[PDB]
Amino acid sequence: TPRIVIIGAGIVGTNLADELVTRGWNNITVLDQGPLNMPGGSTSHAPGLVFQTNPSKTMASFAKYTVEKLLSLTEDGVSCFNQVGGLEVATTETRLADLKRKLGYAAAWGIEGRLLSPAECQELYPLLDGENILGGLHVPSDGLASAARAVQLLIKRTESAGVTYRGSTTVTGIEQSGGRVTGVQTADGVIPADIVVSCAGFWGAKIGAMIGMAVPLLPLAHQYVKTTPVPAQQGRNDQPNGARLPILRHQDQDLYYREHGDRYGIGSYAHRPMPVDVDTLGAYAPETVSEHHMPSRLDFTLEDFLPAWEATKQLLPALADSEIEDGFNGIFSFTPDGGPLLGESKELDGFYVAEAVWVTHSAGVAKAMAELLTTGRSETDLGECDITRFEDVQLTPEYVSETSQQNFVEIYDVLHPLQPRLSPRNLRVSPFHARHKELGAFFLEAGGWERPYWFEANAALLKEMPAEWLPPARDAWSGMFSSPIAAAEAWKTRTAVAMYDMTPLKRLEVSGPGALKLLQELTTADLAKKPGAVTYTLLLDHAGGVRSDITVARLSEDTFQLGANGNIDTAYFERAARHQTQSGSATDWVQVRDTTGGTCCIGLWGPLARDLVSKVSDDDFTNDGLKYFRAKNVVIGGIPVTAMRLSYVGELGWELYTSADNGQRLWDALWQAGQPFGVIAAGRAAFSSLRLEKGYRSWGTDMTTEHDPFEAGLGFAVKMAKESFIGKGALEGRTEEASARRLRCLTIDDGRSIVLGKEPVFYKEQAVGYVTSAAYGYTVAKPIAYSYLPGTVSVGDSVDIEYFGRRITATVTEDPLYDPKMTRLRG
Amino acid sequence: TPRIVIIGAGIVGTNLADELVTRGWNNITVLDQGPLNMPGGSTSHAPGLVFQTNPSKTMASFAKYTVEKLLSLTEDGVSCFNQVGGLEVATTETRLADLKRKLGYAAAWGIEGRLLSPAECQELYPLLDGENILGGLHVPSDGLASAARAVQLLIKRTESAGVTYRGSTTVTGIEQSGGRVTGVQTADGVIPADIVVSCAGFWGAKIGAMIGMAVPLLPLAHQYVKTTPVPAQQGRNDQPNGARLPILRHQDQDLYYREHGDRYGIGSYAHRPMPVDVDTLGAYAPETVSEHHMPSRLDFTLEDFLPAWEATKQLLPALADSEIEDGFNGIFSFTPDGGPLLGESKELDGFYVAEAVWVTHSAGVAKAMAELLTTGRSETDLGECDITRFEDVQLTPEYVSETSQQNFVEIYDVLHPLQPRLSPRNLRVSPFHARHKELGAFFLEAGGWERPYWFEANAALLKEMPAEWLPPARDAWSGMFSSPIAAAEAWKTRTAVAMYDMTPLKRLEVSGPGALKLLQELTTADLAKKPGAVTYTLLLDHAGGVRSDITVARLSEDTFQLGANGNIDTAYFERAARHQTQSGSATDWVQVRDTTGGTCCIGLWGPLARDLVSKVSDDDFTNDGLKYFRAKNVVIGGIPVTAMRLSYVGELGWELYTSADNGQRLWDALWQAGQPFGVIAAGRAAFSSLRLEKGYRSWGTDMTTEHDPFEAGLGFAVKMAKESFIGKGALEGRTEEASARRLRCLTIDDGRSIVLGKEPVFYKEQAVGYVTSAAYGYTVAKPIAYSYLPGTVSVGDSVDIEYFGRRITATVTEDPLYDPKMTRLRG
């Protein structure tokens, strides 16, 4: 098997060694600049609290696996997990409501937990001064990891299986040739490798710069304090590091707690963000590293801890009879969005990262990476962990610094899923931005792009709207980053004509004599059709899982424009094209460009779309001028445009693409043409609700690599008859009808209880699914939610969706909910 | 020699046959759908007035050649030119002033002419009612062409030399294979060809669509009327078509005149534009074509002519005793900018156009095309005639229609060289457009781009400006599309820091394993330098003439960004890259993209540029961070940018390139950083004056293919030591010192008489040059003009520049006028 070098003998790198070994890959060298007995990264100081419950399904499965593995990781009859459970307490109404949402995550992801009353909290954790406790969330399977001990036992069992450990060995560079890794440099010459995995914790960026790779993590310090012996605790625990009470979270004050014998450990994020320059740390001579003297531990700054110490004494008064014994400012990693950084680099074949990973998720990440390395894919969706998810503006040191600090500042906050950052904003805007501002655009952002969710100009339309379009009141939570205005935009889209900004849609140009050959192998469609055809198709992995759903427009013999889902797709195409070019003839070369930023697109949609466009174009837009899912070049308002006839909102019209410098003119020409037809600008709130009424899938939530096309209801898009395509062999014999799990459309019975995503779904009182996407449907006048459900659950069955602790009755409904016979889309 | 098919036996196509023959290329078939004896295009109805004098040097040389050739084109002792001279009369002060400018063109282009007083006009042309005549411009060598007769004599002499003519033969298509022309389709099968030249007059667009080529001409009708016998004219001329008086232009009333025996011919553009659908003309059966029955002649619409007929009787009262005998609405071509359309198509190798050409320029265009075909280049600069000069937005049928009609409406107007159209405007704007509007940008346009010439916000700076920067008053003509504000912008650029919009600069990405190989052959620089280098270099033709001056930035091993001069360059690179790819290995492929529209650029220039940028970037901008004429990637205001250190304005700073979606943020970050430093936005008026103070050349005026690098003072940019590059062999042994003509900088002695361009330059009372570029120099505080001058004329000599009839004393000055030791540009 391939020669693997792992950089880092933290909890990540030693778990990864371990996960590779058990899969038969043992040609591994593990390097660490610290001594093997105590390498001295963040793992060497972590207190090891593990709270599994997480808004993210993947992160939650990573934590569940880590708990399982640490419990099994044992020597002299002592495991590496002490399963005391975990308790998060609420001291405000906002937090108590949020614990109900978190209990929802628990059930969604298969973690057992309960909400505790104030009295039951006191019974479980008598040290709590009960006066400000409104409630708790108790997960019995949570607990304390012994991460440093786990590292030592992983080293020992992997060593026996052939893995080589070199402590006191500093990586100073990475050797490469022809765009693949060939070795790792040390002052002692090069260690050959076919695969390098950087498991270097908060040194990740420094390692990354050695190959020109932006690794978007920031090292940040976080205070951890142990008290002196707490009188109330005398005699209760085994010394020196026993614990019997659940690990304790006090998220309203940025604090968490564990016992260490009769002492308390207090973790505080209740301080200013503290960026750390890794180049200033110094080279620690290995012989010098000890528990208080290691690169990860900076001097304690007591002044930062004072407020945390007061809140502690308030929550746990017994602690007022102890003192602060020892504290440090410990360094670990943060990232712009709080997700880890995993996967193959863009810059260098065979070079991977598994960085910015808490002890909590370590074994999970290791296992995914081991699957990635040995089989070509991870069994768990890595959409939110892949290093290549980031856009170029999100990779600058300044972006990483500013947003990673804000993620530290907010780490324990209750936040709505649509909550935008206040800064940095306005990084990327489409060419319609000034016009969007004139119309009172309410902008949210993703990928650096500013995106209108609705337009305040259209509030003037609410008085004219037919009552059937008026939605009911929303609760405060579903009402955040939402507006009644979206009803009006949905209304006008369904009955007049609307202009949506499609500019942020990932746009890739795949070009050259090998373009068709590349796309024919990567996609599930037969793309060898005369130019003009637009095909909705999938990208799969070799296990048939859905990596993406895409459109491919063939603009000429050698030129294809793809509408993709984000930069994981870009990176996927980039590498696949480079590999075909390198091992092909002069007829296989192919380039991939991300042209998103240099172009723009208006989705011009609704029943008056042809009336509008005919005023500013002499091109033929009739059905016989341009059929559904066809593209051609046209001129609109004097601007050359590529017109594609499809609509993610389910109405007549076209995506109109042009170069950025032309976009404002193209916008103004249409806007003016559309005055007599009541044209509006329409934003993402309406867009999302309308596409949901159409049943159209959104990659990353409605389906990921954990789903095959037939489970996702996307069989129509797989052309099984193709000689060859990635995933074909895996999908032999499967059908939608025979899928054990299927994506179902739910409508909410009461017409008004909106859900948002991730809420667990119960059939006959058992958790069998979870909301993937949802919105209020303005056309059907009810909340809609999607969920996978067991194949045995049928159209017309009834299911419950738990939202903030309350069961909401919904019915499995046939989709599309709107115009399933596509009457609005054809001729 | 190659098999050539010419489409059209008009004055263009038969002259082209002729010009090819005399150059030894006689394998020619000439096709025309009309009968050979009277093909029935525009040539069959033209009255044949030839006024040589023209603002364009090339057009003027085309007309001079046409006069020479038609005079030599003779049979039975009767030539095809009747050299009666030409007279343009002025009936307003505006026109009289403009005739003085036109006399300037005459001397510039070597055409003999004089300005006539009202009395002398009466003596030359006694029929003129003298009362509104303020003056005339008389060119004795002008005259009347007999174009239909010239066609017949060209046919006869080319036929004898082997050329084949097929009349009554309709081209219905063009055959091609592998991107080159292979034949012309008729109902009688295919006529093979290696080279096709479309000489199809106003059918040009229809021919063009047969290969997918946009031919930006519009067919338009123009009225031409013959009177009955004019009493005053009885007995004076040979019948039936004699003429003795000069051809007569009456541009203030859109009219021109010639005698036909004792009748008058009146040409009127004094009517609404009359677009013609060529598809509605009908197929004329050849046997039916006669003088009054031909595809080019539409029914006369007398109502349109009435006002012209009145003005005629006012100018020439003798005509009031005649009547209108016959009129027609004759069709010919117009183009967006009034230039013809020449050269190789972008779409099809070997397929050329020579279309939208007046009888006046016909032989000239034919000769250039013959040179192009047989030698690879024209001896006359075709910058303003090349079909590939147009930008994509300028090629839509709607753009062509609207602007070609306006060119018809303005054909006889006095217009300032900076006069913008009012419509269509706002086609292309940079990402800084809203910000430019906030600052009161005064926008002119070229290439479809809106470009600020100055910013009204900066008027507030005039009260603070040191008096030495305050320019003198401008006359009305040089003051049009000019503002004192430009002095302030030049001032701030020289002493603080300015932000120029460089977005419209043609930007080409040349990429792939054959990129360096292509550029090494096309340019005069050795580009095989590690990435990061920016090189100013030339593109030449095989005769050493300068096609372009360019920058090449090597961004990576296989990736180069060029800053070019416009779409002639784009088209040149496109074809050259396609040809290398087709006849190369898998290591020679190369793509060219025009990324202008998807990107943007700020030129951040002036002595405080480093102070400004250091506030919003942690990249190293010091001299040791980025040397002059080097590029690197940086981050500014959170935006990835490519920074190139050069300055067409002569100051410290950088061109800052980024993708369009990032541009506004990049703008705002710099704007805000620049507040304490007094940053301004600066426009093209200042830019032009500043670059002139630096002596930097502008392709298309300061040099064209008619100049070699040494004549243009660009020897430094030619690396003669290179093994190989286009033009090298031609330039062996030449030096700047030995050049018979050299580009000289002139400063105007009086400090105030501004010239604009094209004004003739006299040494010791002889016309020896002409102004190529000019501006008021704000830094040296005097008007500057460039001109080629004989090598014998030296620095410190004195020359006169004629501006509106007045000699302005100027001195030949060493350039650069500003900072010639580059102290402002280095370290």
Place this chain on the structure above:
Amino acid sequence: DVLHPLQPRLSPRNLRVSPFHARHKELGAFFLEAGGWERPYWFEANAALLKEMPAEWLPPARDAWSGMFSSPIAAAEAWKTRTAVAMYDMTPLKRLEVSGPGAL
């Protein structure tokens, strides 16, 4: 309906605006209204100041109810008012001219 005390109408809006309205829009004014006047409650331009603000000025989280029609941005505007200089639109303040020999 359950309505927050600051809940604005969506229509009719923009009846009365001060002469600084275009400038307020450039700066990302969040407008509420009373008396027909549009009144900025805070300015989105000033969100860029939050990263520079001393921690002592940073407010705690708000519950959903007190957080409606409220923004952390107001902390920054209060900060700059107390330590630098701020421009408030006082235009809607009822202004009466009492004039004539009986005015006093």
